[PDB]
CSV table of C-alpha atoms in Angstrom, one decimal:
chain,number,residue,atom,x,y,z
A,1,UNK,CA,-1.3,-7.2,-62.8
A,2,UNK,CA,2.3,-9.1,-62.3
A,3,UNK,CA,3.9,-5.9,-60.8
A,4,UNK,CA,1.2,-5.1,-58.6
A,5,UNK,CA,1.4,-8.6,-57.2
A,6,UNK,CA,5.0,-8.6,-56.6
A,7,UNK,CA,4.6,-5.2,-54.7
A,8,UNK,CA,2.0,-6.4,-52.9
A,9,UNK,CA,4.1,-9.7,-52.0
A,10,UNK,CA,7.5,-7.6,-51.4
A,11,UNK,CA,5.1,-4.9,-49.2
A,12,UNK,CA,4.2,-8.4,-46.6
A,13,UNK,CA,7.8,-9.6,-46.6
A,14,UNK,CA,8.6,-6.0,-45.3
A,15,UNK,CA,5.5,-6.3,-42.7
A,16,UNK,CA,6.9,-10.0,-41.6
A,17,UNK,CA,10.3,-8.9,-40.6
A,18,UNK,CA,8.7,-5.6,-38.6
A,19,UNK,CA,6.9,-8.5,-37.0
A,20,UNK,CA,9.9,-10.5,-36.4
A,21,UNK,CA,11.7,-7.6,-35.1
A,22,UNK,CA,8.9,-7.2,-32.8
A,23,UNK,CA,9.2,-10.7,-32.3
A,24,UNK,CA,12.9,-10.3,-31.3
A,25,UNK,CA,12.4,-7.1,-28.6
A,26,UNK,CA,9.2,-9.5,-27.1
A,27,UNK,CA,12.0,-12.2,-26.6
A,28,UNK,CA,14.0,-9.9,-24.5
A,29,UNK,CA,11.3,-8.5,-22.6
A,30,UNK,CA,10.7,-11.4,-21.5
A,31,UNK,CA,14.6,-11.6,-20.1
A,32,UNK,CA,14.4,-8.2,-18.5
A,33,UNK,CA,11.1,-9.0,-16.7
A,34,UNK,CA,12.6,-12.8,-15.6
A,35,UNK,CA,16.0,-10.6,-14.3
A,36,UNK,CA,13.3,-8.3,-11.9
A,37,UNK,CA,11.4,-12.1,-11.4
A,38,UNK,CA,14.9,-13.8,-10.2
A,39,UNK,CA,16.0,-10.7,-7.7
A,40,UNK,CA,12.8,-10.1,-6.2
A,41,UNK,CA,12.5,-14.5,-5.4
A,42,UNK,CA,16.1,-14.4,-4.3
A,43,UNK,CA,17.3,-11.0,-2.7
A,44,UNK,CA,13.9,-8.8,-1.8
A,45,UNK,CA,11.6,-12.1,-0.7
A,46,UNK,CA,14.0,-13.4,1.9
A,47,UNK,CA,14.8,-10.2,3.0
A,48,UNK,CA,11.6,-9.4,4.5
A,49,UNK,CA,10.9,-12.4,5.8
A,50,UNK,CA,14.2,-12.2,8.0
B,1,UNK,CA,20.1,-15.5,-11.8
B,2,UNK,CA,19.3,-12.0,-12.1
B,3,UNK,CA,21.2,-9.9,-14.8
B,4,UNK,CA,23.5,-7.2,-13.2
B,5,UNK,CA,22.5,-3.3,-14.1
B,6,UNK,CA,25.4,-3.6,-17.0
B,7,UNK,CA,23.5,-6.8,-18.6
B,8,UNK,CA,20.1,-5.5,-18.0
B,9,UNK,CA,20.8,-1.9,-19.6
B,10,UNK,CA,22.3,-4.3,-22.3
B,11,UNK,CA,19.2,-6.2,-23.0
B,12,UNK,CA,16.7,-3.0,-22.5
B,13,UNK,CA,19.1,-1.3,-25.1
B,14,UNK,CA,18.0,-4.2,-27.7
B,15,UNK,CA,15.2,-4.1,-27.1
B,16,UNK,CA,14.6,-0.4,-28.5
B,17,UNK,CA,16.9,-1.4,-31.0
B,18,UNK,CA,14.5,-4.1,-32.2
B,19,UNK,CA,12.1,-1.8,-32.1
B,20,UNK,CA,13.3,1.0,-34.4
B,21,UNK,CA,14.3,-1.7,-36.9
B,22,UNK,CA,10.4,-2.5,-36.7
B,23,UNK,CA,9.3,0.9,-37.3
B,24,UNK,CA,11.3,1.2,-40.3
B,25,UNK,CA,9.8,-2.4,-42.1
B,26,UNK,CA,6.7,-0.7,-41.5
B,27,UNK,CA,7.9,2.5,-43.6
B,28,UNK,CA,9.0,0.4,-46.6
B,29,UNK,CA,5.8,-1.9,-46.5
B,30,UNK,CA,3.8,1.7,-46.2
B,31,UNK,CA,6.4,2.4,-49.4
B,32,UNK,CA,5.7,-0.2,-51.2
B,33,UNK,CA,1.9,-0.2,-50.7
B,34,UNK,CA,2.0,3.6,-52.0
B,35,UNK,CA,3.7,2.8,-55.2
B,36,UNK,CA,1.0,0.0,-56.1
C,1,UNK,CA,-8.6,-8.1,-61.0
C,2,UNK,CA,-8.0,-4.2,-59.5
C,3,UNK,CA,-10.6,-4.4,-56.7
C,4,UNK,CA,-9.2,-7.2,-55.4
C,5,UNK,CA,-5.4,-5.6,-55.7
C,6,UNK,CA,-6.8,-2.4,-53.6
C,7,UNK,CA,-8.6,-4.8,-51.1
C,8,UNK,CA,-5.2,-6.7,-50.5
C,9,UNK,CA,-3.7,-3.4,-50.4
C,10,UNK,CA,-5.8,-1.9,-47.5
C,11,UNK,CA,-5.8,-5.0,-45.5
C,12,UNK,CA,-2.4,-4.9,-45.4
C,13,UNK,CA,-2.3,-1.0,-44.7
C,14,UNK,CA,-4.7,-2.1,-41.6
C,15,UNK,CA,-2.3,-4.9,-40.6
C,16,UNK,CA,1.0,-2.5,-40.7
C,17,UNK,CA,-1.6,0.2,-38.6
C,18,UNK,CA,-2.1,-3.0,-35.9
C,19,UNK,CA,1.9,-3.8,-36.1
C,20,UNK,CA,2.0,0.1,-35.3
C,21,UNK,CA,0.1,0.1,-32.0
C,22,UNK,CA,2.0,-3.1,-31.2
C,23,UNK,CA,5.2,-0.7,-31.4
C,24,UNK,CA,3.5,2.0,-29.3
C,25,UNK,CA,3.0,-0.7,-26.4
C,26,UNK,CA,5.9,-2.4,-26.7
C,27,UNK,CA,7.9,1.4,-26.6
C,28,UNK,CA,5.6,2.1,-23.0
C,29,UNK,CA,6.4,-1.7,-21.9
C,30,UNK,CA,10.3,-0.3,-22.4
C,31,UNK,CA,9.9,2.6,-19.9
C,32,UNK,CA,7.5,0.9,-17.2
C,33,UNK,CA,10.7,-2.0,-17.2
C,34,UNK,CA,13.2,1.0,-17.0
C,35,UNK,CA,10.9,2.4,-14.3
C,36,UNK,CA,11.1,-0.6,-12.3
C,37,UNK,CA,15.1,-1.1,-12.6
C,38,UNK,CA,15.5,2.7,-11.9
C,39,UNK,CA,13.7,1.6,-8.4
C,40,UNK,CA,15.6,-1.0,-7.8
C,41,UNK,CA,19.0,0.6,-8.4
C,42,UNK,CA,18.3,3.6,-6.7
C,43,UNK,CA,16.1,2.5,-3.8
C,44,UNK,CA,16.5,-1.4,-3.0
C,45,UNK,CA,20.3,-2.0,-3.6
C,46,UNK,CA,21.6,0.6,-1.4
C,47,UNK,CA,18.7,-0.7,1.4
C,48,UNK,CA,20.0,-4.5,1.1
C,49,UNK,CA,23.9,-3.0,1.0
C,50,UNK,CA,23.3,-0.6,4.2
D,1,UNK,CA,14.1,8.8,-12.1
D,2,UNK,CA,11.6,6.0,-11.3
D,3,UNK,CA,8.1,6.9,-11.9
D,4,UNK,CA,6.1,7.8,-9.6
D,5,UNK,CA,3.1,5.3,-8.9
D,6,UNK,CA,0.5,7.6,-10.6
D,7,UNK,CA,2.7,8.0,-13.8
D,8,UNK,CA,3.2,4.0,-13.7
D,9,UNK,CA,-0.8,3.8,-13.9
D,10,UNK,CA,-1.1,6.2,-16.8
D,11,UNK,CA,1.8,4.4,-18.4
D,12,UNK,CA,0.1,0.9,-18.2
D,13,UNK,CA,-3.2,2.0,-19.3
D,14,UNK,CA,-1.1,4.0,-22.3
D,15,UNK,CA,0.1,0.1,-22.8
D,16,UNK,CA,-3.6,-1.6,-22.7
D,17,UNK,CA,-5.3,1.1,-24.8
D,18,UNK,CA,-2.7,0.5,-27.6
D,19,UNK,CA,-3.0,-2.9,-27.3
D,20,UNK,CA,-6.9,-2.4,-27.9
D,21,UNK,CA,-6.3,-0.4,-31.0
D,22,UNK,CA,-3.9,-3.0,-32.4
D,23,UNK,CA,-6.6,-5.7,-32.1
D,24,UNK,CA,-9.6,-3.5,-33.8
D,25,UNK,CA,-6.9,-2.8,-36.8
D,26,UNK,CA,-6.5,-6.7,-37.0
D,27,UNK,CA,-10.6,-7.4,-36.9
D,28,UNK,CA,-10.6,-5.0,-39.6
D,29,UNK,CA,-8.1,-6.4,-41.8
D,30,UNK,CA,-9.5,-9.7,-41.7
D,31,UNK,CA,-12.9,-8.0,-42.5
D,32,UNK,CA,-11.4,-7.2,-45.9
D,33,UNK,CA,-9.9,-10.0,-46.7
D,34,UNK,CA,-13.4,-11.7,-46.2
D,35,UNK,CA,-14.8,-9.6,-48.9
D,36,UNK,CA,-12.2,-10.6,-52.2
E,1,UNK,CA,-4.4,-14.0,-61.1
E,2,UNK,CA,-7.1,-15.3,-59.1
E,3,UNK,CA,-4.5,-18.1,-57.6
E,4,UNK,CA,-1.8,-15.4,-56.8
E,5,UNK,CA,-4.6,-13.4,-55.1
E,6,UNK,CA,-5.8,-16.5,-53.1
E,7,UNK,CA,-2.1,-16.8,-52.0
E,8,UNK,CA,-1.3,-12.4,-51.2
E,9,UNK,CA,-4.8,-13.4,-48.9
E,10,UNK,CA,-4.0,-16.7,-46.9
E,11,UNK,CA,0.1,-14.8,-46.6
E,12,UNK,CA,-1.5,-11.7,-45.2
E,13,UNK,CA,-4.3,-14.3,-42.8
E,14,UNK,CA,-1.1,-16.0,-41.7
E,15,UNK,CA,0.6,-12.6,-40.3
E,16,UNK,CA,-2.2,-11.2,-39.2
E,17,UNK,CA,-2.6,-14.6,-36.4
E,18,UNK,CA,1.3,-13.3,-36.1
E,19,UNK,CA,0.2,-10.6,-34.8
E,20,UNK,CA,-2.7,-11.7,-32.8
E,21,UNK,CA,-0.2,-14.0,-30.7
E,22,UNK,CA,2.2,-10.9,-30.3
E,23,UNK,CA,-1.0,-9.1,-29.1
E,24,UNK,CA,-1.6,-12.4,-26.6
E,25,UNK,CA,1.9,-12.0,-25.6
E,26,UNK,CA,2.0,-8.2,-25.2
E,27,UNK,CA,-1.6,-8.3,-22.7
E,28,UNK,CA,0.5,-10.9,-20.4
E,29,UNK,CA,3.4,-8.8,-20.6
E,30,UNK,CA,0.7,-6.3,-19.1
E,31,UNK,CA,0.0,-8.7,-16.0
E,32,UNK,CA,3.0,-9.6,-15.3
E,33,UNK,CA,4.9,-6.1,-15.4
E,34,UNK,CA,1.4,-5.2,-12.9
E,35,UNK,CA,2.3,-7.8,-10.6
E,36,UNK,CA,5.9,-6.3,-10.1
E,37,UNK,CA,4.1,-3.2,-9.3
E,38,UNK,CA,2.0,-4.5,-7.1
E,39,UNK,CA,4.1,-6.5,-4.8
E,40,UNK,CA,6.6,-3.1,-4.9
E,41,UNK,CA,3.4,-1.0,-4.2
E,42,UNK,CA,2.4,-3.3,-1.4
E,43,UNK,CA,5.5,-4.8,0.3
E,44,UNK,CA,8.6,-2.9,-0.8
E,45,UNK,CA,7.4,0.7,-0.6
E,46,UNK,CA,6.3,0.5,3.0
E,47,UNK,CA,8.9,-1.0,4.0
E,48,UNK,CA,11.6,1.5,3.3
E,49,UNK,CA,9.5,4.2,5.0
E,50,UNK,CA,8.8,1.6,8.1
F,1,UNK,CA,-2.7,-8.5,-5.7
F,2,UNK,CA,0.9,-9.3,-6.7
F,3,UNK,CA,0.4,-12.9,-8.3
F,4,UNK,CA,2.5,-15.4,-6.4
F,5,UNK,CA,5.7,-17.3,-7.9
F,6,UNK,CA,3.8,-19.9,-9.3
F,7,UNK,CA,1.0,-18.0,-11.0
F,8,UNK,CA,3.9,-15.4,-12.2
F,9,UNK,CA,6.2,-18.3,-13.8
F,10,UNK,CA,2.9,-19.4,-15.7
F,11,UNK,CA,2.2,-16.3,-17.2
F,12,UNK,CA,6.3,-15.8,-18.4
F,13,UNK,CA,5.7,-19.7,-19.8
F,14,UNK,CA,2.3,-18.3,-21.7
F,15,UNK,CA,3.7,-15.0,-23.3
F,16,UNK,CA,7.1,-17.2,-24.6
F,17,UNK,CA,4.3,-20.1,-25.7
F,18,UNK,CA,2.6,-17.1,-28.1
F,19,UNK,CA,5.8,-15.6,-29.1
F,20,UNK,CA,7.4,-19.2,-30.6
F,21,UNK,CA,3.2,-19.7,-32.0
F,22,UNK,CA,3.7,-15.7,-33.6
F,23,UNK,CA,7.1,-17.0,-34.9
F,24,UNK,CA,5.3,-19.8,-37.1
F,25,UNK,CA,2.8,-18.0,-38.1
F,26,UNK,CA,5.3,-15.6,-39.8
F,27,UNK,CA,7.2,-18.8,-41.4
F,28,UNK,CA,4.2,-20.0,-42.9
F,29,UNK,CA,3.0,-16.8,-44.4
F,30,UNK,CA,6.7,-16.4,-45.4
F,31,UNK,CA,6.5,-19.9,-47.3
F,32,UNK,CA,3.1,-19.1,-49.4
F,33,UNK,CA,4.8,-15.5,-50.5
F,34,UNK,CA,7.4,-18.0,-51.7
F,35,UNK,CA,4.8,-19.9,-53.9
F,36,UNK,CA,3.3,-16.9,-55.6
């Protein structure tokens, strides 16, 4: 059963790195939603309150 | 400070980037898990 | 040891199954942000500008 | 084209629901793995 | 095998609590991209057609 | 009810707090694959 445990092992490293890449496109969603955060704070808010 | 519509099309660009890779580690695990 | 190979092996189909809803949200999460920058840029710049 | 605030709403329940489905693959992945 | 398959199991526990946080992650990605719609919904929207 | 900008820079701290805990997770099922 070597082989099938060294597909089985290779099959998770291939789920781990989907993860990571998921991992990676989570990191950036969190810049684009602080980018919408910082404008609204610093352009929109003031603007409507003068 | 806010990214400028160049940056943030940048970033939003990665992030489907990041994404497809994803999609395709999940194709070789699927693979991999066939051939057992 | 081959029904515990197939369990491993159908866990880890059902983990690859989660990882693919994860990239179903994380694809919707993409256009709701493009959504709300597409506002922006079209409606709320040109406002603050004129 | 922004989406319209309807659309928005289908799109964030599209978001949730998936998000629902990931975590009942998850619960049933562990379930195996309890029974080697 | 019975080591090798103790290890496949506690690899593929370990991701799957990988992808439980990303799950965590992705339902506060939810409320937060909500609260941009809100305060657009609420204060921005009426206030380009008032 | 749009949180307020406290409430809102608690829940960007919480999803990066899950995203670095995802991130170990990942190394340490990496490092028992290793083992095998």
């Amino acid at each position: 059963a070597r082989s099938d445990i060294e597909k089985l092992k290779e099959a998770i490293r291939d789920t781990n790195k989907a993860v990571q890449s998921v991992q990676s496109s989570i990191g950036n969603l969190i810049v684009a939603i602080k980018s919408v955060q910082d404008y609204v704070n610093k352009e929109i808010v003031p603007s409507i309150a003068r | 400070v806010a990214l400028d519509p160049f940056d943030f099309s940048i970033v939003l660009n990665k992030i489907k980037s990041q994404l497809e890779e994803s999609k395709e580690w999940i194709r070789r695990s699927n693979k991999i898990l066939d051939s057992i």
